[PDB]
Amino acid sequence: GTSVMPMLSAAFVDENLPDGTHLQPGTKFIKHWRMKNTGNVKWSADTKLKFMWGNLTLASTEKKDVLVPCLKAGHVGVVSVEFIAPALEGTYTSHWRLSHKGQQFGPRVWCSIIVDPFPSEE
């Protein structure tokens, strides 16, 4: 015989702030990734969004800026991170992945922006 066993799984659906969005230095913004729980386990306090790599700065700390919804199996929700555009112009990215009880699952999701220089005083 056979039986289903716990499976943590996710699928990317959609997002706001398309990659390459231009922002002014110092802009606080919320990145949203719409995701589906394609597993058979409801997400919980043990489900976290783990930081992978990148140079885009968080608005404060990871405990304050990262939200993982307690998505039921088969449901769609939003994973959100609050960032701040650094002072210097350039390309800034930040990669994340869901993690349940320390085990990574689902796709890698990221935020990619361009910090524009300030407009001239005169």
CATH 2.60.40.10 is right for the domain spanning 1-122: yes
Tokens of 26: 């110092």
Could you give the CA distance from residue 17 to residue 20 in angstroms, rounded to a whole number?
8
| Beta-ladder partners of 5 | none
Q: What Å resolution does this PDB entry report?
A: 2.5
**How do the domains of the chain map onto residue ranges?**
1-122
- Experimental technique behind these coordinates: X-ray
Tokens of 50: 């783990």
| Beta-ladder partners of 10 | 37
Residue written as tokens 């005083």?
A: 121
47: left (phi over 0), alpha (psi -120 to 50) or beta: beta
| Beta-ladder partners of 35 | 12, 77
Residue written as tokens 């939200």?
A: 67
Give the number of residues written for the chain.
Answer: 122
